[PDB]
Write a structure and sequence with these properties.
Elements (H helix, E strand, L loop, with lengths): L1 E2 L3 E4 L8 E5 L1 E2 L7 E6 L10 E3 L5 E4 L10 E9 L5 E13 L7
Length: 105
């Protein structure tokens, strides 16, 4: 089953992106299963902000972030087989935009 935990990433972080900021992993889904990531920040606006590594389940950010655009990107993950079928999910994944030495409290 997809195991996940809120990913708290600091806003304003700059390039070079993309960069892994976490890992969604499945406890038992087929070793062939590759993960989908979806939600505001992925395929929902803001689009193309977060992308998970379909195979590793590594959640990666593609650019900087700001807490006023979204305080929490609520993504949704799904385990998919090489058949493209979803065997698990959609499960939710939350990416919260934390500050860094108070970037913008």
């Amino acid at each position: 089953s997809i195991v996940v935990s809120p990913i708290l990433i600091p806003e304003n972080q700059r390039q070079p992106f993309p960069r892994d900021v976490g890992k969604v992993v499945d406890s038992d889904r087929p070793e062939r299963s590759k993960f989908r990531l979806t939600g505001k920040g992925v395929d929902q606006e803001p689009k193309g902000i977060f992308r998970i590594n379909e195979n590793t389940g590594s959640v990666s950010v593609t650019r900087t972030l700001d807490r006023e655009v979204i305080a929490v990107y609520q993504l949704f993950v799904e385990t998919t087989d090489v058949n493209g079928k979803t065997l698990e999910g959609p499960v939710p994944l939350e990416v919260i935009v934390i500050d860094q030495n108070d970037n913008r409290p």
